[PDB]
Amino acid sequence: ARPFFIICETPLHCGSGNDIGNVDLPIQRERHTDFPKIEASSLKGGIREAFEEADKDIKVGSLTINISDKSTISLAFGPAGALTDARILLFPVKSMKGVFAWVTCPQVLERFKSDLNLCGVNLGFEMPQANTAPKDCSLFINGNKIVLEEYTFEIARDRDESGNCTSLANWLSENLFLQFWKEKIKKDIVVISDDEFRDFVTLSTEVITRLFTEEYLPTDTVLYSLALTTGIFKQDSANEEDMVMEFFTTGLPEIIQLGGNATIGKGIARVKIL
Amino acid sequence: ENKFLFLFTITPVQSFINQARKAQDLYAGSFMLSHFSKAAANKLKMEFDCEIIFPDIANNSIPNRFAAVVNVNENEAQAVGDSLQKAVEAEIKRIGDSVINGLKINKPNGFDEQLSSYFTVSYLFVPYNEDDYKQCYSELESLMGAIKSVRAFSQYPDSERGRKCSICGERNVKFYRMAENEKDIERIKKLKLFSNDVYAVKNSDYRELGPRYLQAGEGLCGVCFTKRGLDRAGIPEYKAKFPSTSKIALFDAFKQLREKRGDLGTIIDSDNYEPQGIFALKNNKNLDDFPELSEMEKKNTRELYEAMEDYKISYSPYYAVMLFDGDSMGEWLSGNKIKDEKLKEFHKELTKKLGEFANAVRDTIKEPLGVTVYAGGEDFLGFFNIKYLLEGMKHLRNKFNELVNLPLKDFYADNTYNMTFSAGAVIAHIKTPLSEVLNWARKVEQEAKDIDDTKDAFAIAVLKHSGEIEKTVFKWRVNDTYTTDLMSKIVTEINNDRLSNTFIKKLNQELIKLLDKDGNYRDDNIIKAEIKRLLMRSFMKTKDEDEDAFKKRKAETAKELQLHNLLIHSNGVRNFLNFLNITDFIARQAKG
Amino acid sequence: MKRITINAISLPYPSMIYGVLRSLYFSHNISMLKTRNLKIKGIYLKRASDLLFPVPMDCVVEKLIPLMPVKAQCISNCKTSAVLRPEKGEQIESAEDGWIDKAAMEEYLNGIYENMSYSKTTIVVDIDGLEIPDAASFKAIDIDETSILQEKIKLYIATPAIFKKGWLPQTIDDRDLEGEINGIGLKLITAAIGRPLYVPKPMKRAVPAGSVYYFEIHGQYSNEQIINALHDKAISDREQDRQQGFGIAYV
Amino acid sequence: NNLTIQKSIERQRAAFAYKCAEAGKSITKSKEYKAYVKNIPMLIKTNGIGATFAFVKAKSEADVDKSGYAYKLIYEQTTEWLKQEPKGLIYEKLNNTDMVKALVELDSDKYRAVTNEVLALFVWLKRFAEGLIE
Ligand SMILES: [Zn+2]
């Protein structure tokens, strides 16, 4: 399989139906932890919509065709294809120094390490412990304290680059981006305690009141997913999954549209393959 | 010995009734169970010598179980049970045979093997020594509750190979209708049904079977079919036309229209218009989805829609399912809370009073209020239009208290006791499949009984689109005032443009940030001040009122809602927030 | 005895496990084209490091109370000649979805029912006679003989079973509840069965995980003969079904 | 279980704000205090915390019956909060100097943290003052 990490460019809003709470158009959430997620029935639909609309020529296996081929898309992935649910890995929160800081709990990092190991990736460093920050962090006022939103946290910086937090930051910077965002992500990555993480992702989501209130995910969010593999490209035979995954990786465009309200520019995202 | 007690029962009660897709199916299932019970009872009463204890057979909907005081020689006793079992089995077989023949359709194969293994009978005599009713009843009930543990069933035959039914998932489809997918084919039996003998018809060919008895690719078992074609079963009592779930939500609009037009009534009661259609035309759609008679049927539906749009009669797409069962019935009937030597009389008195209450409940609940699927003894189950839910709940509780509890006060061991019941209502969108609504309603009803050892509480819930619910649990009385009374008062104030609902959203936003993980903010002063401030801010001034009287209404109204008392007795803060949210939702789904 | 350990409220029936295990084998040996030695010997569902057993229905309720057998003095239509009854009268509500002492249940099997406190997520399986890749995620390990250590004895049912008559061993005869299941004879005296489950293939009715059967030693058998002829041994009616793993029984 | 740090601070802000509102209502000119507590956030927005609190100090009146006593009470109350709320950012200075003097010898980051802290306190102080005083 192949981990492909989605990053948002404009606020993303997937319809979750209706509610009798405060927000009148919430976003889909995990059924038992309230972490946001994107339904596969929408991710795959959007990717197919991108494919059915794109037009270019790729080279897979031996021959060469154009991804607009109705048969190719109809067979490879869906009319039932040889080719999960979206998960949240980073989240932005306002800070007094640095404008914004990314925060992730140890539980999400453990889930991430579990998810990657199927693909064979071996990070090689133990995930960072809770309440830690990189060596060159720029969010610290008075040394031992950071102020996210209007609250104060206590965090200890990693003395040397050998530590877990610095290694995770470096690996994320290198793998996640193919310059400013790369330079920043290696410095501003905080790891708050698990319990405090749930509060941010529940009471820190944009709510634009157009009378009723909608809800969107903040821009600059980082999400990850898994894509696994198992006529025009029939070839001698499908050598393991090397055919379908090759087609998928070759064809994946750089900009995709997800969620509703797309007529007013919402829901644009960037797709990259690990 | 020569004197014996008795207790008859039919096993499948909840699951069997739950397996329904249309309200007609649920009504038919309840009716079938009641009919078998009454058949057994009538056979016993009119042949041997005996007197019934629990259910007054004269009632309309007897429960699944009943007792009696039968006197016979012990040697012959075992025979009677066999007679009753045989009679009930024969009645079931007869009803099935009548249902198949009613439509004059050649019977498929496998019916006799899918209708004669889906029920159970049981009974447990006990010696009676006419000196301690308590001991004999306790022994009988314990033995009856233990005997049911030995569930014996017969395995399905090897012929079982099918595609289920879209109602059950445990039987072979013995019916079908050919959808639009294929114009016509015998391959449907070959591939789609994967079976040999399931009689089917073509989507275009509707002569033998009318629309009511199937739709699209709707599979049905033997029982599912028997439970829908009962209109031709030939039983006089059955009501031929039963309102559907969609129709119930239209109870108010039709009533409002009739007061303005007279001629329109003739079609309204004719049952000649598709009920779910008018909802489609509301959402800017065409009638091509549902093929109909077209003998001006679509014309009549369009006329009704145009008339209702013209008269400005707004209707909502939500309905409500409410059920309630008496609490602590086992202790009450067991004599643990009755005078030392007056249980035998108390049984008959309570049975008579419960029969009277059942008749009263049947009489009061009618259109446009709702329909009573079945109401007998303590139990109950019906549909309510969302614009009359609270009035109905209060009326039922008050009538129960006035007709069953207070009259029996003399028998109670201590005058401070009371006999009450808990209730649970779940709102849902008409599009939602009915089985999930019923199961959720049962769950909320069973949960509301767990508020405290005293019970005497009710629960309301809303079934969201995703599939989760938000509930509120409250006592029936909060300092000599029904809680539903306060809910109705708030709803009426909000609907009449006299109090904006901005004091619910603001309060939700403000008090969420202080709630712990489970939810308990235990500082009274802060919350009381917040409630007072926001409520007094929320009021509005009517164009008729002056600038001097407004300061009197603004103060008197806040003394009626009694928000502080609701908060004190709310057993939590998130419960109070959910209570307010559900009140706002109900107020929204009404006209306002 | 390679006991797999899969990762993600009801533990699926053994029928689904067979299909998943078989399907994985073919995905790596596509040339095989047109498995017969695959036999299951138990399915467990532990969300906790200790394996978890279902709560037997013979025990009724925060704590559990033990039932006892008593020949009734009533006239009824029950098939069994005896029925369970609590020793002392009280409010008896049968536990539903209860999970027996995750490891202390052995005391329950052994007869030590002192305090079966129990609650009011990964799957495990037992395999043999096949080789599969060493790695819903799943993993494969090895083990030698590990299992639940063991004139009448009960018979737990830790996995759904599919009999022939429906609720009694095919050897057992309805005439007098007499027969011999898997050589070791017996006679039926009582039972406690939960709501049957329904489970191309032909649907069947299954005894739920938690059923308890009571029997009496039919004849003269060696303690070893009986002690090993049933314990952890799949008890069913059809040999084909026995392989699939229907009827995991304890003694 | 223990409460998240995101709420252990709000549960303190609200309590302190309510106590301050009651203490204000106690005095003989509660109306003036209620009026004054509704202007400081706007002044902070328009000018800045240092100038706002210098001006507040300017109008302080010694006697407890004078219309300006409210400003002195506000000075003292907002001095108490800054000792505890920032968790030691500006505690070391207030111990031996007037608050305004300290509030002009800080860098930019401490200045912005103190500004946010004061605005967060006042959003609750004025919220309770609007209620408990009519
Ligand atoms: Zn069915």
Coordinates of N, CA, C and O and ligand atoms in Angstrom, one line a residue, chain B residues 165 167-168 171 221 224, ligand 1:
Chain B
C165 N -34.9 -11.3 3.0 CA -36.2 -10.6 2.7 C -36.2 -9.1 2.7 O -37.2 -8.5 2.3
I167 N -36.6 -7.6 5.3 CA -37.2 -7.4 6.6 C -36.5 -8.2 7.7 O -36.1 -7.7 8.7
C168 N -36.5 -9.5 7.4 CA -35.6 -10.4 8.2 C -34.3 -10.6 7.5 O -34.0 -10.1 6.5
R171 N -34.3 -16.2 6.5 CA -35.3 -17.1 5.8 C -35.2 -16.8 4.3 O -34.6 -15.9 3.9
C221 N -40.7 -13.2 3.4 CA -40.7 -14.5 3.8 C -42.2 -15.0 3.8 O -43.1 -14.4 3.2
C224 N -43.5 -12.7 6.8 CA -43.6 -11.3 6.3 C -44.9 -11.1 5.4 O -45.6 -10.1 5.5
Ligands
ZN1 ZN -38.7 -12.0 6.6

